[PDB]
Design a protein around this ligand. Structure first.
Ligand SMILES: N#Cc1ccc2ccc(Oc3ccccc3OCCn3ccc(=O)[nH]c3=O)cc2c1
Lengths: 401, 547
């Protein structure tokens, strides 16, 4: 009920980001939503004296036909002053089950600082540029802004105080408009506890971290090896030597001596089997000296494996993986690569939020124009990570497969 | 008098850390001075400006050409940024046909909108006295000055705020704003249409806004932003192509611009051969000759611009269709229409500048462009007609290492068709000869060697002059392709070559790569395996090409 003064970083003007084109249905949905929000005082129309703009578009969440408004507050976020700090719950990732809740509706009760409102300006675009679009600015705390949870921290603490005092075993973390709740109970007891908590949030997406770990480098186990098999093996081991110190391939290479056909079977010498076994023993151990740095960015790389399968690696320094995984979930995206990639990016970002409490910078195996054209059609998250585009095919694709 | 409705001002500030403009007044002739005096006297009588005292430290230069001209460049440099309403322009194909469309231009446009009083003092200017024997005549604006940064945006927003209630109370008509013009359209009867026009100009008159009392000064076709807007169709204003035996770079830029502008409705416009002469620009004065390709192309452009072509308006009740055709040399052309043989608009897409490429990627990019343009203009994605088989696309996107997608589309059999020219095997080929290839070169003498050895004992090493490591690595693979059967396994340590081939190009800028591709096309089955170099991998003989 009392506005807290918010300013911007020194030497930085407000955000002036181009609003990208929208389809007519999304425009209509946004018009409806913003018309309703104007009647609720949440937003207000502005004049041409407001040169600032933030991109905005419409989405549809899971199991919902009702449209939703999403604002790309990225530029405003990085141009917004740094707020302060709560240490990330390192036990959140260790819990058996974590549920994500949407607490965005709470933000709209708290009024925004007057002087700062002009920086939250956004535009519902017009088709064919007939009009300069409908312009609004936020009066209350906007969903997507990094300042909203920071300001609402005390309030959320006050609301969640009794539940926290009640269940000391239940972990509660918050990121943006999302509230992550971890426990070790049972799915039924979990859902009832969730209904309980949402009821506690009312009067004022099952996710299992335990079923996700880090992935070791595995080598084939065959009775008979062909030349090709050994060539691929030597390649993989040579690659893995960049990560694991003691990897040697000379005795395996010794078998390839001569120019044989790729499909020809070669029996392994004893030295070769020994070398292979040693390499296995080496790969079974974790990676040497791999630490997380909060001051550094998280980098995520994604490779398309085919048949709805995708691999990913989160790291900070090259060959120093902090997390690895393989998304292969099929859910109505059997004929669409972009949808699969978008969902994969979302999942990876979620896991990243659970583990480190911040989003990674993606390196997407897709042309810039394609991604920029279609990614908003399948996005169902209230946050948005950063991304770049890799145009050169990596050779390591089949080394994670 | 009837008190016309007021208009709330728009709060305007100067840029932070800056102050109002203070510029020395230019010397003006006695004639100019007299003219300005009379003009400003009339204006002051009208209420557009007001006389001020010497307290005001701000001043703006003014000239006479009689018509006065206030140079606000410095004040514009010192005036805040505005939400500029002009970014991109409407496209005639996006407009939805109406039985009637009338135009109401606004006279006394900017001088009918009040300026924020706190800002008026910054727009101060002086008129030089005769012989400068008296202090100059001091004035300030009470309304929006023409040439001022904030005038168009504020005028636009005011006009919108005024027009909104009339629009809301008349959903059976559609009103559009553009600068000093209003375009009203409806499907009503002509009498009721003129009636509602009258109601509109009365409504505007209540705010003291004057419209043509006579028969409206402009009737179809409307000449707007280079377009001709007719009742049943739209086109572009007549094309202007100069002909001279000595061309400069600037002339090339203007010609390219005009051809690109014409290509939105005229199909089959090509601009590559003329655009290749824009390399090494920034030198506007030059004499660039023409090739046979460019001259034949320009002749074909004069062949297309020979007879007029018209585009239609948009009808939301019908589907939206875009058809694409390959034109070769990285050129693509497309037509967006709803009914056959009647285009909404047309266009072209040129491939990006890269080392290697294939047809499918370019087609995909073209689809991207058309899609984005479509969403801008009509707010939806059109169904596509593409010159590519469903199976081709399937195989492509399934095996492609990148993620890719095309919206709803169908195959149209209009050659040339986009096809996959070759496909690498996924596993080694049984009964196929195995070519271990390698290449190497001396960095200093630029001398090199490229070759292969196979499982059957087939060998070859070729000496090369003026070449590099990458070139020899490619050359080795090429040699393997040349001297092999219809099915072949190939082993290389070149990450470079493997990258190139895994990028799957069907044409390149490097002749060697093109030759390799032509070899691949002739092949039935090709398996390309990779191994690390210098790992003592038998077969892989780095010691054979390093001599
Ligand atoms: N922003 C903007 C903007 C810029 C220029 C315009 C020109 C005519 C026009 O006209 C229209 C105004 C309102 C609604 C529908 C319109 O046009 C449908 C097409 N059309 C055209 C000309 C004609 O003679 N007959 C027609 O059917 C609307 C315009 C809007």
């Amino acid at each position: 009920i009392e506005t807290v003064p918010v300013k911007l970083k020194p030497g930085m003007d407000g955000p002036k980001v181009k609003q990208w084109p929208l389809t007519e249905e999304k425009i209509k949905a946004l018009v409806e939503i913003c018309t309703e929000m104007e009647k609720e005082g949440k937003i207000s129309k502005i004049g041409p004296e407001n040169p600032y703009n933030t991109p905005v578009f419409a989405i549809k969440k899971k199991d919902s036909t009702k449209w939703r408004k999403l604002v790309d507050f990225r530029e405003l976020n990085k141009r917004t002053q740094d707020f302060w700090g709560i240490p990330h719950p390192a036990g959140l990732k260790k819990k058996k089950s974590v549920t994500v809740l949407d607490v965005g509706d709470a933000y709209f009760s708290v009024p925004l600082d007057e002087d700062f409102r002009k920086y939250t300006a956004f535009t519902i675009p017009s088709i064919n540029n007939e009009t300069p679009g409908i312009r609004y600015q936020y009066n209350v705390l906007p969903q997507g802004w990094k300042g909203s949870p920071a300001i609402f921290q005390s309030s959320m603490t006050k609301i969640l105080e009794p539940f926290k005092k009640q269940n000391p075993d239940i972990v509660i973390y918050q990121y943006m408009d999302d509230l992550y709740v971890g426990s070790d109970l049972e799915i039924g007891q979990h859902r009832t506890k969730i209904e309980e908590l949402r009821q506690h949030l009312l009067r004022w997406y099952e996710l299992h971290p335990d079923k996700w770990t880090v992935q070791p480098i595995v080598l084939p186990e065959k009775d008979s090896w062909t030349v090709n098999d050994i060539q691929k093996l030597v390649g993989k081991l040579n690659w893995a030597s960049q990560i694991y110190p003691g990897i040697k391939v000379r005795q395996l290479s010794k078998l390839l001596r001569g120019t044989k056909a790729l499909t020809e079977v070669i029996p392994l010498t004893e030295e070769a089997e020994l070398e292979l076994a040693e390499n296995r023993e080496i790969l079974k151990e974790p990676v040497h000296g791999v630490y997380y740095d909060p001051s550094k960015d998280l980098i995520a790389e994604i490779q398309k494996q085919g048949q709805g399968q995708w691999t990913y690696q989160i790291y900070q320094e090259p060959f120093k993986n902090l997390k690895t995984g393989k998304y292969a979930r099929m859910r109505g995206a059997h004929t669409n690569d972009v949808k699969q990639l978008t969902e994969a990016v979302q999942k990876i970002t979620t896991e990243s939020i659970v583990i480190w409490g911040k989003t990674p910078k993606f390196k997407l195996p897709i042309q810039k124009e394609t991604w920029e054209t279609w990614w908003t059609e399948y996005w169902q998250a209230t946050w948005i990570p950063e991304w770049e585009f890799v145009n050169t095919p990596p050779l390591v694709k089949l080394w994670y497969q | 008098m009837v008190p016309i409705s007021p208009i709330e001002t728009v709060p305007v500030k100067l840029k932070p850390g800056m102050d109002g403009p203070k510029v020395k007044q230019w010397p003006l002739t006695e004639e100019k001075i007299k003219a300005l005096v009379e003009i400003c006297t009339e204006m002051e009588k009208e209420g557009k400006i007001s006389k001020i005292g010497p307290e005001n430290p701000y001043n703006t230069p003014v000239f006479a050409i009689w018509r006065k001209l206030v140079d606000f460049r410095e004040l514009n440099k010192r005036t805040q940024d505005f939400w500029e309403v002009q970014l991109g322009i409407p496209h005639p194909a996006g407009l939805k046909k109406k039985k009637s469309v009338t135009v109401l231009d606004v006279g006394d446009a900017y001088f009918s909108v009040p300026l924020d009083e706190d800002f008026r003092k910054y727009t101060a200017f002086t008129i030089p006295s005769i012989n400068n024997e008296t202090p100059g005549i001091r004035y300030q604006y009470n309304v929006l000055p023409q040439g001022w940064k904030g005038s168009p945006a504020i005028f636009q927003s005011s006009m919108t705020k005024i027009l909104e209630p009339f629009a809301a109370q008349n959903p059976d008509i559609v009103i559009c704003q553009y600068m000093d013009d209003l375009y009203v359209g409806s499907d009503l009867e002509i009498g009721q249409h003129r009636t509602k026009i009258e109601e509109l100009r009365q409504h505007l008159l209540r705010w003291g806004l004057t419209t043509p009392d006579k028969k409206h000064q402009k009737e179809p076709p409307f000449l707007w932003m280079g377009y001709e807007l007719h009742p049943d169709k739209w086109t572009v204003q007549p094309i202007v192509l100069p002909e001279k035996d000595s061309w400069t770079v600037n002339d090339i830029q203007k010609l390219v611009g005009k051809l690109n502008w014409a290509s939105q409705i005229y199909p089959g416009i090509k601009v590559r051969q003329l655009s290749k002469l824009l390399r090494g620009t920034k030198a506007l004065t030059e004499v660039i000759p023409l090739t046979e390709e460019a001259e034949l192309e320009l002749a074909e452009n004069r062949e297309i611009l020979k007879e007029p072509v018209h585009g239609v308006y948009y009808d939301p009740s019908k589907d939206l269709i875009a058809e694409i055709q390959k034109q070769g040399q990285g050129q693509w052309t497309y037509q967006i229409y709803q009914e056959p043989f009647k285009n909404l608009k047309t266009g072209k897409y040129a491939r990006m500048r890269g080392a290697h490429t294939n047809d499918v990627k370019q087609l995909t990019e073209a689809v991207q462009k058309i899609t984005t343009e479509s969403i801008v203009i009509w707010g939806k994605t059109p169904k596509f007609k593409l010159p590519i088989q469903k199976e081709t696309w399937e195989t492509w996107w399934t095996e492609y290492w990148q993620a890719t997608w095309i919206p709803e589309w169908e195959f149209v059999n209009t050659p040339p068709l986009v096809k996959l020219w070759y496909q690498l095997e996924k596993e080694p080929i049984v009964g196929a000869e195995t070519f271990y290839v390698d290449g190497a070169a001396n960095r200093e003498t630029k001398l090199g060697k490229a070759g292969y050895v196979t499982n059957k004992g087939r060998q070859k090493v070729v000496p090369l002059t003026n070449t590099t490591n990458q070139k020899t690595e490619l050359q080795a693979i090429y040699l393997a392709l040349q001297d092999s059967g219809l099915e072949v396994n190939i082993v290389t340590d070149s990450q470079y070559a493997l990258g190139i081939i895994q990028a799957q190009p069907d044409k390149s800028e490097s002749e060697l790569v093109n030759q390799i591709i032509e070899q691949l096309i002739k092949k039935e089955k090709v398996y390309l395996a990779w191994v690390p170099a210098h790992k003592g991998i038998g077969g892989n003989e780095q010691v054979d090409k390093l001599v």
